[PDB]
Curated annotation (Swiss-Prot):
E3 ubiquitin-protein ligase whose activity is dependent on E2 enzymes, UBE2D1, UBE2D2, UBE2E1 and UBE2E2. Forms a ubiquitin ligase complex in cooperation with the E2 UBE2D2 that is used not only for the ubiquitination of USP4 and IKBKB but also for its self-ubiquitination. Component of cullin-RING-based SCF (SKP1-CUL1-F-box protein) E3 ubiquitin-protein ligase complexes such as SCF(SKP2)-like complexes. A TRIM21-containing SCF(SKP2)-like complex is shown to mediate ubiquitination of CDKN1B ('Thr-187' phosphorylated-form), thereby promoting its degradation by the proteasome. Induction: Up-regulated by IFN. It comes from the Eukaryota. The chain holds residues 291 to 468 of 470 of the full protein. Residues 8-185 form the B30.2/SPRY domain. The coiled-coil is necessary for the cytoplasmic localization. Disulfide bonds: none annotated. It is found in: Cytoplasm; Cytoplasmic vesicle, Autophagosome; Nucleus; Cytoplasm, P-body. This is E3 ubiquitin-protein ligase TRIM21. Homotrimer. Component of a SCF(SKP2)-like complex containing CUL1, SKP1, TRIM21 and SKP2. Interacts with CALR, CUL1, FBXW11, HSPA5, IKBKB, IRF3, SKP1 and VCP. Interacts with SKP2; the interaction with SKP2 does not depend on an intact F-box domain. Interacts (via N-terminus and C-terminus) with DCP2 (via N-terminus and C-terminus). Interacts (via C-terminus) with IRF8 (via C-terminus). Interacts with ULK1, BECN1 and with ATG8 family members, including GABARAP, GABARAPL1, GABARAPL2 and MAP1LC3C/LC3C. Interacts with TRIM21 and SQSTM1/sequestosome 1. Interacts with IRF3. It comes from Mus musculus. Autoubiquitinated; does not lead to its proteasomal degradation. Deubiquitinated by USP4; leading to its stabilization. Autoubiquitinated. Belongs to the TRIM/RBCC family.
Length: 185
């Protein structure tokens, strides 16, 4: 692809994080902590899942960023509406305001309802995310495989400002502690 020139510098918003997440000082990395991270509760925090939002809000234009997923077993990545539900149980779907892909139990899937199987020959270590607000497009690229397309959501109905969306995943197995990292431009 040729989306690299729309690169944006994303930072994580501490205030939206699940209370067990540890966001690095530079606000570019996030990982699952061993316990509650000693923060007050607020209506922004994701309660049920290890999720956090980027600080940036997008309502126009073309945006691109890259995330490092090296050695993780589970994660969700994409964008979501600023107004998505934070508390309780919910599914990642466009109807709920999410445009995402994920890894879970050795399979990659796009967060459609119901979910769509992805065909990835080279397990990615870094994912590129492209958003064209006007066109209604969210695309995912495999940076490990020369930028090959993973998935395009088209005819998106954003219906609000978008925020970068992250889930570090659960670590029941002891094999999913590694962080998500925002890769340099
Ligand atoms: O992933 S875990 O090993 C450590 C965190 N716990 C509690 C927790 C935090 C957020 C959602 O649920 C689940 C099992």
């Amino acid at each position: 692809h040729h989306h690299h020139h729309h690169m944006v510098h994303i930072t994580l918003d501490r205030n939206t994080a699940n209370s067990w997440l540890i966001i690095s000082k530079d606000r570019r990395q996030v990982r699952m902590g061993d316990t509650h991270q000693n923060v007050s509760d607020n209506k922004e925090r994701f309660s049920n899942y290890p999720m956090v939002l980027g600080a940036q809000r997008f309502s126009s234009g073309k945006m691109y960023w890259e995330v490092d997923v090296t050695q993780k077993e589970a994660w969700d990545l994409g964008v979501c509406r600023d107004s998505v539900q934070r508390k309780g149980q919910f599914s990642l779907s466009p109807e709920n305001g999410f445009w995402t892909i994920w890894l879970w139990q050795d399979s990659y899937e796009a967060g459609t309802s119901p979910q769509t199987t992805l065909h990835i020959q080279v397990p990615p270590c870094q994912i590129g995310i492209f958003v064209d607000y006007e066109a209604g497009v969210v695309s995912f690229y495999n940076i490990t495989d020369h930028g090959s397309l993973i998935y395009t959501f088209s005819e998106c109905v954003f219906a609000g400002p978008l925020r970068p969306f992250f889930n570090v995943g659960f670590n029941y197995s002891g094999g999913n502690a590694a962080p998500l990292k925002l890769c340099p431009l």
